[PDB]
Amino acid sequence: TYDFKNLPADSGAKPTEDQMSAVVATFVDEVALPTYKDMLTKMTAYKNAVDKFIASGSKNDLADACDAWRAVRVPWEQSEAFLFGVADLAQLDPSLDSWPLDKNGIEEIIATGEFSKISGAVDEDAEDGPQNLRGFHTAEKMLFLDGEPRDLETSPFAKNELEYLKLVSERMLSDTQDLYNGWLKGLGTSDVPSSYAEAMKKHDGSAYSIGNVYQAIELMLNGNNGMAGISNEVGSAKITDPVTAWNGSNKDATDPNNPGVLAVESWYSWNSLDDYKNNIVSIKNAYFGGRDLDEESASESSLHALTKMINPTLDSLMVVQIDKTIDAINAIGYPFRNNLGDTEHINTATEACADLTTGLGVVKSKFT
């Protein structure tokens, strides 16, 4: 009979500052920095694989580049529960991963070779802002066709499009380096002067307005770019918005202008459901205090432990809900671009994200 809006009384135990500081430390050292390190390693393999393909024209090298694209995408999407800090401050989320794309501008660059248009600073209010001509999805669009490696004779590359692919992938690597370095040691720029990891571990107001340990925990849970942000975004935006478009449409998944299909992020490669699942794995890692950890393997310095201590029922409801949300995402028909009419499964999934969002709000309330 208990739910997130109808809880029993808290235990009365409140965590100490040293306890909360250890949760933040373990988050930074066992969730953030390793996710990003794994991303840098996988991004370097991805750029090397793309390069080897550009050099050869080999179908096997292409397949390998495609695999490498998917593999670097795991840790990136597993990092969306913590877009605060460098990802936010240095504009790297939109630089790396804008959707949708300015498809007319991409085609134009392929024709003219004006590659300078793709390497500028993020500018979110111009339609031809550079961010919308680069990133994961521009590479995707060139590597993949409806779920598969592109066919090199069915849809042949333009010479300029190959150079475009190389430039996009250089910049994907560069942004990833900046992300990991920004956390690890800082970039020495106006926006990211010093280590974000250190400013988070110290939480003493010396950098980035992280003023005390309560602010650091609130940051992890927050609704703009923390745990509640990504639960809410997966449910209300990534899943809901393409379904809304589909419902207003002709409901023909084979029509290249179907607005539902076109709104599905990673439909080129059919990576959408893996993305959404990985976004909730990001929450799960965050809550249990390590990559791929769960309740039965959780760190003692985790949000899980502190919530359990404050209210066992709320924690227990959170344990169930993280797993219910992942299971609901996984039960949606694959690929998502052909199953936008899979109503029952989609609804369980969007209701489960909406409930994980409420739950994370309640957890956050125990620290403000």
Residue ranges in contact with Ca ion by CB under 5 A = 97, 123, 148, 151, 153, 209, 211, 215, 236, 240
Q: Which of Cl ion, Ca ion, none does residue 336 bind (CB under 5 to 8 Å by kind)? A: Cl ion
Q: Which of Cl ion, Ca ion, none does residue 344 bind (CB under 5 to 8 Å by kind)? A: none
* Closest separation in Å from C-beta 158 to Ca ion: 17
* Closest separation in Å from C-beta 225 to Ca ion: 10
The answer to whether the annotation marks 107 as part of a ligand binding site is: no
| 289-348 residues near Cl ion, rule: CB under 5 A | 335-336
Tokens 């024709």: give the residue.
Answer: 111
**Residue of 198, 316, 291 whose CA lies nearest to 305:** 316
Residues in the chain: 368
C-alpha span between 178 and 183 (Å, rounded): 8
* Closest separation in Å from C-beta 177 to Cl ion: 29
Q: Which is nearer to Cl ion, 166 or 238 (CB)?
A: 238
Q: For strands 144-145 and 148-149, give the pairing.
A: antiparallel
Which of 273, 306, 314, 360 binds Cl ion (CB under 5 A)? It is: 273
Q: Which is nearer to Cl ion, 115 or 334 (CB)?
A: 334
Q: Which is nearer to Ca ion, 211 or 312 (CB)?
A: 211
Interface with Cl ion includes 270 (CB under 5 A)?
yes
C-alpha span between 236 and 253 (Å, rounded): 21
Contact between residue 282 and residue 230 where contact means Cβ atoms under 8 Å apart: yes
The answer to whether the annotation marks 99 as part of a ligand binding site is: yes
**Residue 155, exposed/middle/buried by CB under 10 A (0-12, 13-18, 19+)?**
exposed
C-alpha span between 23 and 217 (Å, rounded): 8
Q: Which of Cl ion, Ca ion, none does residue 272 bind (CB under 5 to 8 Å by kind)? A: Cl ion
The answer to whether the annotation marks 209 as part of a ligand binding site is: yes
Interface with Cl ion includes 260 (CB under 5 A)?
no
Q: Which of Cl ion, Ca ion, none does residue 316 bind (CB under 5 to 8 Å by kind)? A: none
Q: Which is nearer to Cl ion, 183 or 270 (CB)?
A: 270
The answer to whether the annotation marks 175 as part of a ligand binding site is: no
- Angle separating helix axes 213-221 and 343-365, nearest 10 degrees: 170
Tokens 């794309």: give the residue.
Answer: 101
| Contact residues for 345 (Cβ-Cβ < 8 A; gap 6+) | 328, 331, 332, 333
Interface with Cl ion includes 144 (CB under 5 A)?
no
* Closest separation in Å from C-beta 21 to Ca ion: 16
∠ CA 349-132-194, nearest 5°, is 85
* Closest separation in Å from C-beta 268 to Cl ion: 10
Q: Which of 102-110, 175-183, 249-257, 267-275 is the region at the interface with Cl ion (rule: CB under 5 A)?
A: 267-275
In Å, what is the CA distance from 196 to each residue of 129, 184, 188, 240? 28, 7, 11, 33
Q: Where along the sequence are the contacts to Cl ion (CB under 5 A)? A: 270, 272-273, 335-336
Annotated binding site for Ca(2+): 77, 80, 97, 99, 123, 125, 148, 151, 153, 209, 215, 236, 241, 265
